[PDB]
Structure 1
């Protein structure tokens, strides 16, 4: 009894301390493929949803580098970059044509 009572000593405080260290949103798991539960914060669509999200600062930097407005949906980033590449190809072709013409 002494041994089991010692195990439960300050049990509430011990649990509260561990709870205070946890991130609550990490508990919100969603299944995209019905099988794999991932925390909603790790979803690619939520990287810009909240200023406190872990990857917000990094992606804010990526949006500004590719000149994509912050109000745009995250699903637009790859399409936009693809268009930029398309534009680069077009500009190169124009330069080559003009250089040849000169």
Structure 2
């Protein structure tokens, strides 16, 4: 119980710190050929035009 309690110590503050560094648009997946989900940021239209 001491070992598993130490793993969970500051769990919320660890996840929030990692989440703060993420780019939300990189999570947004789109399917071109029905099977392959690519991040919308990897689409050439978005690489070239997205601010």
**Which protein is bigger by CA-based radius of gyration?**
1
**Greater length-normalized contact order (CA 8 Å, ≥ 6 residues apart):** 2
Give TM class, smaller chain. Answer: 0.7 to 0.9
5+ residue gaps, structure 1, are 52-102
5+ residue gaps, structure 2, are none
Give the ranges of 4+ consecutive aligned residues of structure 1 lying more than 2 Å apart after TM superposition. 47-51
Aligned length: 51
Shift of 1:44: 1.0
- Richer in strand (by share): 2
With normalisation by structure 1, the TM-score equals 0.47
Shift of 1:26: 0.3
With normalisation by structure 2, the TM-score equals 0.87
